């Protein structure tokens, strides 16, 4: 049973916060995965990408541990990517699933040509970069699908991008640097200031401010 330990989990459990977009608006750090399980929940699907054995040499021999790369995603929504190392593959996968739920971002979607319908592609050209690997997402018209390698295709389809162009650079055989690079590019879709985001930001009250009278009873 979830007994929440943070100020935010006590607000999430007590129905005070109605969406994940409030936590994203105030950029609050999320330290419990049950917040994500509360909000997305029944529409959140995971894919193991690679089980990677790493070896440290020791005085007694070498310890072999196992590294799991788990991408999780709500299709049309949000996408996260967790990596966990452990001495056992099942615990590595479960810890990477928790750690992938924990690092879930929203992805902004846009239009290629005229804005008729629902958004279907990236809003602009975004580059992600992680350890020699460069991944660039280029907007594509309605219905081309994802034109990418099979590793960013997983993360991009989980993020809800219908159709995109992609270009990679570097040593993409390292699936870790090639998965986190596209995750860095997907996480940049809200940080890009485009002219429709030029209005002045009317501020609202933070959840730690509006519910300061509910939080003192606990």
């Amino acid at each position: 049973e979830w007994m929440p330990v943070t100020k935010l989990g006590r607000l999430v459990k007590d129905m005070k916060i109605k969406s994940l977009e409030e936590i994203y608006l105030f950029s609050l750090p999320i330290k419990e995965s049950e917040i994500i399980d509360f909000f997305l929940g029944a529409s959140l699907k995971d894919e193991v990408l690679k089980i990677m054995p790493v070896q440290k040499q020791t005085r007694a021999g070498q310890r072999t541990r196992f590294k799991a790369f788990v991408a999780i995603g709500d299709y049309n929504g949000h996408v996260g990517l967790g990596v966990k190392c452990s001495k056992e593959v099942a615990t590595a996968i479960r810890g990477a699933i928790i750690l992938a739920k924990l690092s879930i971002v929203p992805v902004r979607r846009g239009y290629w040509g005229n804005k008729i319908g629902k958004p279907h592609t990236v809003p602009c050209k975004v580059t992600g970069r992680c350890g020699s690997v460069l991944v660039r997402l280029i907007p594509a018209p309605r219905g081309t699908g994802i034109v990418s390698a099979p590793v960013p295709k997983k993360l991009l389809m989980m993020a809800g991008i219908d159709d995109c162009y992609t270009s990679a650079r570097g040593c993409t055989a390292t699936l870790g640097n090639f998965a986190k690079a596209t995750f860095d590019a997907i996480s940049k879709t809200y940080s890009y200031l485009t002219p429709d985001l030029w209005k002045e930001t009317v501020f609202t009250k933070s959840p730690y401010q509006e519910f300061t009278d509910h939080l003192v009873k606990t």
Binding site: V48, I51, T64, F66, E88, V89, A90
Partner: peptide
């Protein structure tokens, strides 16, 4: 058991087969 097969045989000749069987077990199908 694909987990135990993977953890025993990941270094041997049968490493790619137990990797494929583990990925089959993990990612549905």
């Amino acid at each position: 058991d694909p987990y135990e097969d993977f953890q025993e045989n990941w270094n041997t000749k049968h490493s790619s087969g137990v990797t494929r069987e583990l990925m089959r077990e993990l990612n549905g199908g």
